Design a protein around this ligand. Structure first.
Ligand SMILES: CCCCCCCCCCC/C=C\[C@H](O)[C@H](N)COP(=O)(O)O
Lengths: 337, 269, 57, 232, 128, 221
């Protein structure tokens, strides 16, 4: 049995040698003539309240106005970012939730939960009241993130070592991807909508292929857990946050590591990461009450957000690039601009 | 009537203490910048107390400045505005204290977290705390003039009906006994609650720390008693009573409580 | 028995992964810089737009 | 299956009183703020009453205020309109209309069958009432002109189009502009500037003959149009 | 790259001292607590040692107290465990484990059926 | 100004807020307790009468709701962060099985020192107390074999049973009192297998925890 491990170690050493040979010069040193952006000051343009619990997930949708937020209160609320008015307050069967998702068509909403069942609620209906449309079950593990491909497909990640691609009408698991030898805590869909990355608690980020059904590339680092991942607008890079203070930017065409962001006086952990429309802000939450903003091309922190009193669970940049929504473990949700 | 009423009855430091109290209460009155809204149940009562203290400071500032040789040149109607308003002012200081006390006792008796809003009763209490003082100060402006007869009017404040002092001291005694009772049974309830549960650290914190913070009753009574015992001895004493005349100093100590009441309720945070 | 199959699967996955073509890091860095500079004039957060075009306030 | 059934018809002697009821079954009645619509014989539609969700606000028409009353009952799922001190001119047919107001919603969706009863500052909402001859296989356009510009600061323009067939209750085709209610085909279109509006029908069919009504919603007293008829 | 290796095992007569060394790589060794756990044949994982970050606050389990010495060296990242006297019941595989998060004293999932940061392990045999 | 549709939307928003607040007002009557324990130790017998088992009971007009999590995986450092606002974490161990007992202490320590769940006071229980007396009276096995510190321990039914019980209790008490100070404590409560007074003990302990929380929060102490 030792020969198998020797062969695996030899292959790993060969891969490491190939990566080292392919490396020419780090991005952190070539971009030295680029003038850094000035101090970025953002005020709380709006505050949304009346939830009475801890916010866990939030999603914007294809439009820049509507916003879906979920919490442990047992109510999933749809807001309005221009007038701070509520549209729907959908109850939940199970009090414990961990994720929410807003469909690109603007007609369906997806929940999660500490249970194994992923619920899909309808919005546009003849009667005028939101009712549960589907309940996809049989996963054996708490869900972490739900994402919509279109109105007839959905991709989910759970606590066990699997990521599933379902089918709303049939209800069965169309495809399943196995790996990560541990928990899976993040998900994000590429703009091409053909590939998607997943981050695990094994300190591994993998690039799953939707069409085929097998992993293609894997990236390692962070020395610890991973609980936040996001893409780059180009589609050839992605950013990953970790349990320690570091946030890393990984290249997709070449399986390397480009830059790492961390300060010597930071001892907290990262909860959510999301880029900007132009891809030069890399907004990142933190375990402590603050939330920093990094210059993506040159690792010089620029500006800070005041933040809430408990923590920063989810942070989202709108598709138009003119708003940043931050949730928290206290009920208040803040829209900055 | 002023001449005969005054005949029958027979500086930097005070301004400094008035400035001290007014600035001290102004520095903490707003509290809008800090997010104290989750614990706002206590904080809005504190704000009420701060407003009462600021009004008391302003009333004392105008009262002491206007009184003196200028008093005789002043019309009799305006004179009440100095004797009356401060009676409202300090009236809003002591009574509002009880508004805090009965607020605590109700929370520590029923099995429920502080997150319960209980919004309707708190505004009622904070409104009645102002209203009772306002009506108490508005009682003497119409009637109780004491101008009909030279007797029944005292030297602690000229031409003022002595009988009103009896009602004032009755109200003060009622407030004092109520706050003493309400701040006494919290200690007994904490002692009794820890008996069944058998907390191994009850004597370390639940017994020694509490009695330290129930010293506010003493720090309030030991400094508010002298004014009312002086009122009682002035009512008791009669034309030539040497201790009756010298009363301008002790009332100062009364407003000095405004310098200490807010901090002991806020510095612990 | 299951460990042997797991090792076989891991070896196969490593062999499949080792054949992926790669490009120089400098090219990727230049591409990222060029893309970030090209669309740097349309980010509302990078360049503060006045109150005329601001919908929130 | 949304059902709205109304009752309370008959004949009224002048100076009398009556009560009309509208029963709903099929949807959630507690969230819909319903209206009333009155149509005189051979005349255009009129707005006569209103009631909101939770009875928060109640509006009327200046020619009717002080004689009617409207009240909804959620537990019985029934809307009541009591009418006192009638006049000889208040003989018409009544329609029970629903509406739900939020972002992206659509009011005036389902119209009742209708019960018969025989005994200053508003917007004109005028349009040409002349009949427009039509032939299957050709496109037509219907105009609508207002007095006050309907383009609010929010960017929306509140102007609705309604179609009524010769023997059926009216249904909503286009709410606001360029928005089509679910169930209608894609042939119908609507376009125009702030003050002029036009509804275009392409690839005309046999069942599209009827009367078309313009409507506004800026000022709360609503005024329907005269109605344009399509024949042959 | 969080691989952990072990060395120093083998077979030894009952009553002889033996040393085990755990080597770590891929992370800053001076930020995480460390633990030694064991698995006997037909038994579950049993936590058997502990060591904090700086070197103080050394804990132990009752069954091996006073006979096992655990030490940590940071210059060359190494974890040493030395056993003085041995009994026939101490025939088990030993795993070197690290706490999940840095700058904490939790060690919440040191022992588990499957884990990410844990070495392959070496086996020690006494009296066959 | 604001158009009619905007005003109607605002009215609907106000109604939604009122209904949501009125519904959430009933979330304070029920007190939530988590349950933790070992597989062999009784978990569904202390209180008479994937998945999440739930138990509801009523004591002196107070409603208690207890959650037991089962069907998940062994690694529990991620889904335990949700249980951050629970009133108490009932902990049930076994005091009649020495061999596994050393494991249980670890489950008490990692919970006590966790960065989250820090301000939640556990309510310890010791099931199978009747078997402890039977095992102590018999001389086949002695607790000194696994615990070397018992041979010199002295006392601070038969005296041996009392000494063993107090040693077992102090083993958890020391761990509870070493780390946390002034935020949470433990309660042994020395339960039995078929005792029918557990609900009263839980009610009293919850009352004490709530009173301590109110006293600390209002700043009286
Ligand atoms: C139930 C609570 C009631 C609390 C009331 C507080 C009592 C305030 C005392 C009123 C001061 C009376 C007279 C002045 O001292 C005047 N400026 C003449 O001063 P003078 O120029 O003669 O020294």
């Amino acid at each position: 049995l030792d020969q198998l491990r020797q062969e695996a170690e030899q292959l790993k050493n060969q891969i490491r040698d190939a990566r080292k040979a392919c490396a020419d010069a780090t991005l952190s040193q070539i971009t030295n003539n680029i003038d850094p952006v000035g101090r970025i000051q953002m005020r709380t343009r709006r505050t949304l309240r009346g939830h009475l619990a801890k916010i866990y997930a939030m999603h914007w949708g294809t439009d820049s106005r509507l916003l879906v937020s979920a919490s442990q209160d047992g109510k999933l609320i749809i807001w309005d970012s221009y007038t701070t008015n509520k549209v729907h307050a959908i109850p939940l069967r199970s009090s414990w939730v961990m994720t929410c998702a807003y469909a690109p068509s603007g007609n369906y909403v997806a929940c999660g939960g500490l249970d194994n069942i992923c619920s899909i609620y309808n919005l546009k209906t003849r009667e005028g009241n939101v009712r549960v449309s589907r309940e996809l079950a049989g996963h054996t593990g708490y869900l972490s993130c739900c994402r919509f491909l279109d109105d007839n497909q959905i991709v989910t990640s759970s606590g066990d070592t699997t990521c599933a691609l379902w089918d709303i009408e049939t209800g069965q698991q169309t495809t399943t991807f196995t790996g990560h030898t541990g928990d899976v805590m993040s998900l994000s869909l590429a703009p091409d909508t053909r590939l998607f990355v997943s981050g695990a608690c094994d300190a591994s980020a993998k690039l799953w292929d939707v069409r085929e059904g097998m992993c293609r590339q894997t990236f390692t680092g962070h020395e610890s857990d991973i609980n936040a991942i996001c893409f780059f607008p180009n589609g050839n890079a992605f950013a990953t946050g970790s349990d320690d203070a570091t946030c890393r930017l990984f290249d997709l065409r070449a399986d390397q590591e480009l830059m790492t962001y961390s300060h010597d006086n930071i001892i907290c952990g990262i909860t959510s990461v999301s880029f900007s429309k132009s891809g030069r802000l890399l907004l990142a939450g933190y375990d402590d009450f603050n939330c920093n903003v990094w210059d993506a091309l040159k690792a010089d922190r620029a500006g800070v957000l005041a933040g809430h009193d408990n923590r920063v669970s989810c942070l989202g940049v709108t598709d138009d690039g003119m708003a940043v929504a931050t949730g928290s473990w206290d009920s208040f949700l803040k829209i900055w601009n | 009537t002023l001449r005969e009423h005054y005949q029958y009855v027979g500086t930097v430091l005070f301004l400094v203490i008035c400035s001290f109290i007014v600035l001290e209460n102004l520095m903490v009155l707003i509290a809008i910048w800090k997010n104290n809204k989750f614990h706002n149940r206590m904080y809005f009562f504190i704000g009420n107390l701060a407003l009462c203290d600021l009004l008391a400071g302003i009333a004392y500032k105008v009262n002491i400045l206007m009184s003196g040789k200028k008093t005789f040149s002043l019309s009799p109607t305006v004179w009440f505005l100095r004797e009356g308003s401060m009676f409202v002012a300090l009236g809003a200081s002591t009574c509002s204290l009880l508004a805090i006390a009965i607020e605590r006792h109700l929370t520590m008796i029923k099995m429920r977290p502080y997150d319960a809003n209980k919004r309707h009763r708190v505004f009622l209490l904070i409104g009645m705390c102002w209203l009772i003082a306002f009506t108490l100060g508005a009682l003497p402006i119409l009637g109780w003039n004491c101008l009909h007869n030279l007797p029944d009017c005292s030297t602690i404040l000229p031409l003022y009906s002595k009988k009103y002092i009896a009602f004032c001291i009755s109200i003060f005694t009622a407030i004092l006994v109520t706050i003493v009772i309400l701040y006494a049974r919290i200690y007994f309830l904490v002692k009794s609650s820890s008996r069944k549960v058998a907390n191994h650290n009850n004597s370390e914190r639940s017994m020694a720390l509490l009695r330290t913070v129930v010293i506010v009753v003493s720090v309030f009574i030991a400094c508010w008693s002298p004014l009312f015992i002086l009122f009682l001895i002035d009512v008791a004493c009669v034309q030539a009573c040497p201790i009756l005349f010298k009363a301008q100093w002790f009332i100062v100590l009364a407003v000095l409580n405004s310098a200490m009441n807010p901090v002991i309720y806020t510095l612990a945070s | 028995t299951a460990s042997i199959a797991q090792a076989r699967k891991l070896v196969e996955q490593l062999k499949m992964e080792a054949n992926i073509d790669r490009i120089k890091v400098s090219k990727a860095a230049a591409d990222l810089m060029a893309y970030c500079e090209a669309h740097a004039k349309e980010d509302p957060l990078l360049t503060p737009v006045p109150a005329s075009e601001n919908p929130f306030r | 299956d949304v059902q709205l059934v109304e009752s309370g018809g008959g004949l009224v002697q002048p100076g009398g009183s009556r009560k009309l009821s509208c029963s709903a079954s099929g949807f959630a009645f507690s969230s819909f703020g319903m209206h009333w619509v009155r149509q005189a014989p051979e005349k255009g539609l009129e707005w006569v009453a209103y009631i909101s969700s939770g009875s928060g606000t109640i509006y009327y028409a200046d020619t009717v205020k002080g004689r009617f009353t409207i009240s909804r009952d959620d537990p019985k799922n029934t809307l009541f309109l009591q009418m006192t001190s009638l006049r000889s001119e208040d003989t018409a047919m009544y329609y029970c209309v629903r509406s739900i107001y939020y972002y992206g919603s659509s009011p005036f969706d389902f119209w009742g069958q209708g019960t018969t009863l025989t005994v200053g500052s508003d917007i004109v909402m005028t349009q040409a009432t002349s009949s427009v001859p039509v032939t299957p296989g050709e496109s037509v356009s219907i105009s609508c002109r207002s007095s006050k510009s309907l383009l609010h600061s929010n960017g929306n323009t509140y102007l609705y189009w309604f179609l009524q067939r010769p023997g059926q209750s009216p249904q909503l085709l286009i709410y606001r502009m360029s928005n089509l209610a679910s169930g209608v085909p894609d042939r119908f279109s609507g376009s125009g500037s702030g003050t002029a509006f036009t509804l275009t029908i392409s690839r005309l069919e046999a069942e599209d003959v009827g009367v078309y009504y313009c409507m506004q919603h800026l000022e709360y007293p609503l005024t329907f149009g005269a109605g344009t008829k399509l024949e042959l | 790259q969080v691989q952990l290796q072990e060395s120093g095992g083998g077979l030894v007569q009952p009553g002889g001292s033996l040393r085990l060394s755990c080597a770590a790589s891929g992370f800053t060794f001076s930020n995480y607590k460390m633990n030694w756990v064991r698995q006997a044949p037909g038994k579950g994982l049993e936590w058997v040692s502990d060591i904090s970050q700086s070197g103080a606050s050394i804990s132990y389990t009752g069954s091996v107290k006073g006979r096992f010495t655990i030490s940590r060296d940071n210059a060359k990242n190494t974890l040493y465990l030395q056993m003085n006297s041995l009994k026939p019941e101490d025939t088990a595989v030993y795993y070197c484990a690290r706490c999940p998060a840095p700058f904490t004293r939790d060690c919440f999932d040191v022992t588990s059926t499957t884990y990410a940061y844990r070495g392959q392990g070496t086996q020690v045999t006494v009296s066959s | 100004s604001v158009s009619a549709e905007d005003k109607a939307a605002a009215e609907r928003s106000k109604m939604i807020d009122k209904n949501l607040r009125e519904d959430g007002e009933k979330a304070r009557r029920t007190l939530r307790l988590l349950l933790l324990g070992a597989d062999n130790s009784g978990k569904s017998t202390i209180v008479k009468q994937s998945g999440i088992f739930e138990t509801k009971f009523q004591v002196d007009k107070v409603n208690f709701h207890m959650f037991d999590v089962g069907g998940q995986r062994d690694e529990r450092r991620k889904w335990i962060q949700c249980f951050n606002d629970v009133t108490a974490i009932i902990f049930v161990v076994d005091s009649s099985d020495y061999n596994r007992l050393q494991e249980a202490l670890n489950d008490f320590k990692s919970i006590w020192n966790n960065r989250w769940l820090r301000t939640i006071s556990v309510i310890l229980f010791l099931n199978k107390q009747d078997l402890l007396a039977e095992k102590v009276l018999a001389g086949k096995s002695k607790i000194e074999d696994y615990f070397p510190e018992f041979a010199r321990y002295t006392t601070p039914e038969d005296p041996r049973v009392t000494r063993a019980k107090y040693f077992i209790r102090k083993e958890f008490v020391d761990i509870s009192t070493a780390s946390g100070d002034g935020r949470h404590i433990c309660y042994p409560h020395f339960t039995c297998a078929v005792d029918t007074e557990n609900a009263r003990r839980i009610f009293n302990d919850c009352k004490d925890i709530i009173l301590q929380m109110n006293l600390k929060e209002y700043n009286l102490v």
